[PDB]
TrEMBL record, chains A, B:
Mg(2+) 1 binds at N41. Signal peptide: none annotated. This is Heat shock protein 83-1. Residues 30-180 form the Histidine kinase/HSP90-like ATPase domain. ADP binds at N41, D79, N92, F124, T170. Homodimer. Belongs to the heat shock protein 90 family.
Length: 213, 213
């Protein structure tokens, strides 16, 4: 009755921990790939709810939103796709991230590029190229909304609040690094969206803050 | 498997919140009553396990320990009594604290003294006379160990860790206010223990840090 919420703390698997330390510390020059990777993830979540709707009509217009916030120095990638249940968030999609990370690091060793992250299903982690903390708020039809957060110190948290009113989908918030403020600028974001826009079957809306007339 | 622990956050009932704000801010000159109140609480917990042992032998030597720590600026009152389950901690002993607080504040209004706190069953809160944060670690035979913590901001937390190895009883840790450092000194603690020692049916051990010979 007087309950405000709860926070569970988990340690990452050893592999994911190495990936995070690698990404957050790399000098990789083409950091902008993070946007493509998050929009790619968002698109796959919209595909999952779409492919599901081809069996049950009970699960409106699927879209992807890119929201900069110069005040909080954050960048958000919002979608209204399938969403993630607590088991999805708490396990880091389970065997998906673990096998993916091992295989991705094995690819980089053998000659690969950081840009190949997505081929291993672990493109979400590229968010740490431009961010030092990432907040993932997801709501799946089969569960309530949860908040995943990590700053890459070997751990992450799962926060549950009964005061929650989050609709189906995923909201990924990127707390931008001092040097990565360029990803707030709407001219940089427009260029990047257009760059992959033709390859994503869903509308991508950019919500930016002046018209001279 | 990779779980480190959890923290639940609750808001105090309105009455308990007023009691806490009153205690933590009062100029009451005889703050030393906090020790009597905690030792009294500790004794009642030893009585509960004793009265229980008069029916079942399965529930060794019941004692009360007073532990100062000049390094962390903390004072601890440890007992090996009945302990408190999660429901005991999460509800603040339920109807006990709520009715007690209302009745205690009604007594003070009518002419009462802060020292009467214990007659209302809410003497635990007197710990806020000398402390700005109180940590309560309790283990009951019917449950695992939990950690209650509050700094009197209208809320408290319940922390559960699977890494826990706390034996039956209650450990109350008082994070002492700048002006209340006198309660670390072993001469002050010896005087106070002796002052009520004859009225408590359990041994009270003081664990202090020099013998000149
Ligand atoms: C495809 S529909 C269901 C899954 N969708 C998504 C998955 C991720 N991924 N992927 C991975 C992993 F494991 F690397 F693949 C991870 C995450 C986020 C995390 C918080 C679970 C940590 C994590 O490990 C990110 C965003 C979405 C989205 N936008 O829906
Ligand atoms: C008597 S055997 C079972 C209960 N024993 C104890 C109870 C308290 N009390 N009493 C109250 C209340 F409600 F004011 F009475 C409260 C608490 C601690 C709290 C964290 C539950 C917050 C709180 O509200 C403190 C210490 C012990 C002990 N040493 O065993």
């Amino acid at each position: 009755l007087y309950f405000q919420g709860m926070t569970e703390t988990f340690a990452f698997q050893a592999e994911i921990n190495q990936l995070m330390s690698l990404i957050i510390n790399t000098f990789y020059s083409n950091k902008e790939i993070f946007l493509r990777e998050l929009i790619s993830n968002a698109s796959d979540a919209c595909d999952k709810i779409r492919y599901q709707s081809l069996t049950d009509p009970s699960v409106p217009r699927l879209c992807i939103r890119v929201v900069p916030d110069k005040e909080n120095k954050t960048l958000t990638v919002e979608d209204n796709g399938i969403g993630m249940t607590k088991a999805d968030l708490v396990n880091n999609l389970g065997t998906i991230a673990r096998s993916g990370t091992k295989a991705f690091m094995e690819a980089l060793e053998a000659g690969g590029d950081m840009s190949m992250i997505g081929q291993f299903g672990v493109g979400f982690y590229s968010a740490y190229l431009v961010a030092d903390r990432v907040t993932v708020t997801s709501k799946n039809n089969s569960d309530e909304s949860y908040v995943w957060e990590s700053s890459a110190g070997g751990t992450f948290t799962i926060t549950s609040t009964p005061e929650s009113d989050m609709k189906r989908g995923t909201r990924i918030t990127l707390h931008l690094k001092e040097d990565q403020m360029e990803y707030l600028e709407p001219r940089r974001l427009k260029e990047l969206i257009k760059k992959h826009s033709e390859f994503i079957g869903y509308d991508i809306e950019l919500m930016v803050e002046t018209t001279e007339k």
